[PDB]
Amino acid sequence: MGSSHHHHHHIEGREEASSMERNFNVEKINGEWYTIMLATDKREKIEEHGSMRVFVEYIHVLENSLALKFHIIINEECSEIFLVADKTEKAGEYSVTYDGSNTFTILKTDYDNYIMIHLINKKDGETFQLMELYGREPDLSSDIKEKFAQLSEEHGIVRENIIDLTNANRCLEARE
Template sequence: MALLLLSLWLSLVSAQDLNPRTIVRRNYDIARVSGTWYSISMASDDMKRIEENGDLHVFVQSIESLEDGRLKFNFHFMLHGECVEVAVVCDRTDRNGEYTLAYLGENRLLVSETDYRLFVTFRLQNIRNGTKTQVLALYGRLSELRPSFLHRFEKVCKTYGLGPENIISLSHQDPCYRYRR
């Protein structure tokens, strides 16, 4: 029995390893992104937008691929000390993994990469009053990911000109975590 429990524990631990061969960077099967997600990290070239009280300081609860091709995000955030839930629906474009939405300006949302099973990285490009802002978000199927995922996120951020000083951790910082369904 102890051997069975040990092998089960080892399989769960190894299942959380980052496997570069399973990472998808194009031709996304967006339906496989549907489900429960947790905010792990965010990065931006405008830090005040993703830091506490920033308009993009949100925590993902779930993502749903809708039948018409749109993508629905369920987020929550703190507003005046209360947890507020909001649903955001993004319209699909003609390009695989690319969506648009109207929120504080014009936005393009792109899937950067995913393995569907453990992580997904999104890139948001916002233009508001002529000012461009770039945000990257790392979401995990678990509330915490191993350091290998965080290192990979740093590399992805670097390809978009964002260094470690542009990255914030959101793991274990979700003030509404206890209200998740």
């Protein structure tokens, strides 16, 4: 008998480093987005049989506000909702009407990673914490889940509530 041999090679593509958010620009976010994962202290509200699992399909920037378009599962079919968030006395915080009172703020969002949005809703004298994450693509790195999840703890949100909507209603076929 005899014996054979072989070899192996490496992979190139050394990524580069980035600087601080000095090149900030609204034009970057201005356009469209995609749903990555849904989190909230009330997982029952974002359930499959709930009505609080609405997600935006595209984000628009106005002169003195920001337009948005969310959808909702109605009769086993996607929907189309339109709303506008007007700026408040304080910059960064935006208020919009939707089934009552709603107000979000930009705490952390990168055009190279993803955009986080802390939305708080109130109803029946009961208010819960809601979170929304969007990325350039419908699927982000597995590490991103834990990266954005870190902020979830801030609102007392446990990973137990953080579930990937990838294997759930996407409705990405309705949007355009």
